[PDB]
Amino acid sequence: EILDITPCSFGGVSVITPGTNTSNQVAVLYQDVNCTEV
Amino acid sequence: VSMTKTSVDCTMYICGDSTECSNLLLQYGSFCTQLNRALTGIAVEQDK
Questions:
Q1: Hey, CA dihedral for B11, A18, A31, B42, is it positive or negative?
Q2: Which residues of this chain are annotated as glycosylation sites (chain A)?
Q3: In this complex, do B16 and A7 lie within 8 Å of one another by their Cβ atoms?
Q4: Are A6 and A33 in contact, with CB atoms under 8 Å apart?
Q5: Among A4, B5, B15, B44, which residue's beta carbon has the most beta carbons within 10 A?
Q6: Residues of chain B found within 8 Å of residue A7, distances taken between Cβ atoms
């Protein structure tokens, strides 16, 4: 049977954080990928 | 005006899901880090 192969690890990861003296809250951005794991 | 923003993962490109290859690449120092920083700077300059 014909089977396709697609490499894993879609896109990258980016970190959004304010100034160190403002707050420690952060937001995670996953580049060029839909929300799957979350 | 603006060039397409391309971010190349030298860790994945050089080594695909390999640990020994990852260690061998790390043995070369920050070349992968330097390339990643250069590409990020290119993207930032294009945005600017």
A1: negative
A2: 21, 34
A3: yes
A4: no
A5: B15
A6: 16
**From B7, B16, B17, residue closest to A12, measured CB to CB:** B7
Question: What is the identity of the amino acid at A1?
Answer: E
> What's the reported resolution, in angstroms, to a tenth?
4.5
Identify the experimental approach: cryo-EM
- CB of A8 less than 8 A from some CB of B: yes
**DSSP annotation string for B1-48:** --PPP----HHHHHSSS-HHHHHHHHTT-SHHHHHHHHHHHHHHHHH-
Find all residues with CB under 8 Å of B15, minimum gap 6, and list them. B21, B22, B24, B25
Across B10-21, b (16+ Cβ under 10 Å) vs e yields ebeebbeeeeee
Distance in Å, alpha carbon of B24 to nearest chain A alpha carbon: 21
